Amino acid sequence: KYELIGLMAYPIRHSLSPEMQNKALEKAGLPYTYMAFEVDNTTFASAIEGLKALKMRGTGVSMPNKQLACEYVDELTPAAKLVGAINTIVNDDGYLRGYNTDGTGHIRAIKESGFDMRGKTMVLLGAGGAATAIGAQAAIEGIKEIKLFNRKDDFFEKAVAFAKRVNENTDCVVTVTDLADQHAFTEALASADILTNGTKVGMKPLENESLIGDVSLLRPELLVTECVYNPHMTKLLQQAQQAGCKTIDGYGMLLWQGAEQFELWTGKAFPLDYVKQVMGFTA
Amino acid sequence: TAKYELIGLMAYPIRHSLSPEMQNKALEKAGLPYTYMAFEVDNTTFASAIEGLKALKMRGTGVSMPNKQLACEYVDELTPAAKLVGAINTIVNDDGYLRGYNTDGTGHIRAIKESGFDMRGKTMVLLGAGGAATAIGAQAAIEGIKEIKLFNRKDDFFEKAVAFAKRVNENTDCVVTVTDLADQHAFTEALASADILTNGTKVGMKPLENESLIGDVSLLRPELLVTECVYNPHMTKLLQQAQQAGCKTIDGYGMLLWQGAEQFELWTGKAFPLDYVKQVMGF
Ligand SMILES: NC(=O)c1ccc[n+]([C@@H]2O[C@H](COP(=O)([O-])OP(=O)(O)OC[C@H]3O[C@@H](n4cnc5c(N)ncnc54)[C@H](O)[C@@H]3O)[C@@H](O)[C@H]2O)c1
Ligand SMILES: NC(=O)c1ccc[n+]([C@@H]2O[C@H](COP(=O)([O-])OP(=O)(O)OC[C@H]3O[C@@H](n4cnc5c(N)ncnc54)[C@H](O)[C@@H]3O)[C@@H](O)[C@H]2O)c1
């Protein structure tokens, strides 16, 4: 009969994955049901037991389990090994494969727009789950250099370690700089082909903030990408659009991220345009 | 919807179970936020499936062959009837505390009760000593039946019948006796004193569909109530003999519907849409 696909996260409040996945599955009439489960670090190992025992087809993974999940799969992709976090598990007859679709999804959205990131230079803001996933995938896709900026918080040392892993295991060049070093930021922005916000700046309670203070730094030839999807148009994207830049919003990454999970689980093509419409992703 | 809770069915194999359709139609009719799904679970994977059930916060699960006996050691509490049977077909998860019930027993008994029959103080001839027969015998004893005259051939279930009889005789006020099906004089005499005859054996179901444990239809007095656990076919040979003799009868679907209704109510705390499900299932 139907096979189950889970989501293992805590809290699972208002995630868009259940609606996206069930709408897509129902569109093609596929024999799967996606359901979210409140699972945290203390219950994750037993949830995986459950995933194997019940013969679940797989599960999505979100906070606080993305790092822990790497230790519960039999095989990780090269990008997931650079990130040290996964958001997708596929159960192939008891053999678990882990993937990070946030990285591939963001890169796909960029590629769909017509931008070729091979040999380009990126200024990446942040060093959490979104930023590291994007940086890892960008490196694998042949981006020349990623100039990563992060403030002096808990993620700074994570950024340093992340850059070390990318520099030693890919041909990409990753640098890490304090967001407070304004001169270095301006210099990096000047050299950039793509600016990517992977921070929580732009999302509530930081919805009225942007890491760009001087819009003249936003040259029209600069591509600006955003991970934040609530609100749909962040302050940064508004600045970028007003400056005449091409942009890619959070829904781009979210949709493609989702498409990739769907395809790994079902082996069928994701009904992208349909999902985009039903989810109201186009303003 | 992400608010939905999961109710499983843990069995092997999962063939033509009517539970998924019944429960989901009923859940939908009531607009309740539950999804019922079947999972292939055997004695080897059952322990881990229960860890899954707790970790994922499933509302509960149906249990069927080959796990009904094993399941008793994985719940925290068993109803008195389940203690007599040594098997459950229902688990309810109340915040991590698991309760085990056997709705096969209560369902068959509810079916009888609905027909207008009062089993308090009555005598039953019970055929068999497997899961269905012991579930019925246990609940009937708890319902106040005076005596259960159980008949079983000399196969692996005969010693089980004896042990079952002892548990019932020692923990209820009901008197249970166990006799060899081959003892025709014993059978004839028990039938003459019976108020109710219940088939809990596989006789009547393929490949024994052309068989009935009643060889002389005159033994079926019109006042005798005949109930049948076999539901495929709907009209067993025994039920045809009984209706032909003027007996009041209860078929396998009576038991199946009420078994289901009781599981639904235990998991949801809401009324089962009985008239609706009877209608949509085709009964
Ligand atoms: N579109 C998508 O599919 C998608 C996927 C993943 C994440 N996201 C979004 O990306 C954003 C980041 O998520 P994450 O999981 O990577 O978060 P995280 O907690 O893992 O990382 C947070 C990052 O933001 C930085 N940061 C936080 N507050 C800051 C501030 N006031 N100023 C400057 N920097 C600050 C931190 O240093 C860190 O680098 C969120 O808004 C999230 O909703 C979107
Ligand atoms: N209507 C329902 O909801 C419902 C629920 C449970 C079981 N059932 C039905 O009840 C029947 C028995 O199921 P069970 O799970 O108790 O099986 P079981 O394997 O647990 O027990 C089988 C019983 O049948 C007897 N038996 C088998 N072959 C026989 C034969 N040739 N002659 C005489 N006796 C014989 C055995 O001695 C034993 O008593 C099945 O047909 C099943 O479909 C119906």
SSE arrangement:
2 copies of one chain form a homodimer.
Chain A: E1 3-9, H1 17-28, E2 32-38, H2 44-53, E3 58-61, H3 66-69, E4 75-76, H4 78-83, E5 88-92, E6 95-99, H5 101-112, E7 121-125, H6 129-140, E8 145-150, H7 155-169, E9 173-178, H8 182-191, E10 194-197, E11 223-226, H9 235-242, E12 246-248, H10 250-266, H11 272-278
Parallel strand pairs in A: 1-2, 1-3, 4-6, 7-8, 7-10, 8-9, 10-11, 11-12
Antiparallel strand pairs in A: 3-5, 5-6
Residues 104, 128-133, 152-153, 155, 157, 200-203, 205, 208, 229-231, 252, 255-256, 259 of chain B line the site of one nicotinamide-adenine-dinucleotide.
PDB class: oxidoreductase
Keywords: Structural Genomics, Center for Structural Genomics of Infectious Diseases, csgid, NAD(P)-binding Rossmann-fold C-terminal domain, Aminoacid dehydrogenase-like N-terminal domain, NAD, oxidoreductase
Assembly: dimeric
Describe the structure concisely for a colleague.
Two copies of one chain form a homodimer. Chain A has 283 residues and is an alpha/beta fold. Helices cover 40% and strands 20% of the residues of chain A.
Named at the architecture level, the CATH assignment of the largest domain in chain A is 3-Layer(aba) Sandwich
Largest interface: A-B, 27 and 25 residues
**Biggest sheet: strand arrangement of chain A:** 2-1-3-5-6-4
Give the structural class of chain A: alpha/beta
Number of distinct beta strands of chain A? 12
Radius of gyration of chain A: 19 Å
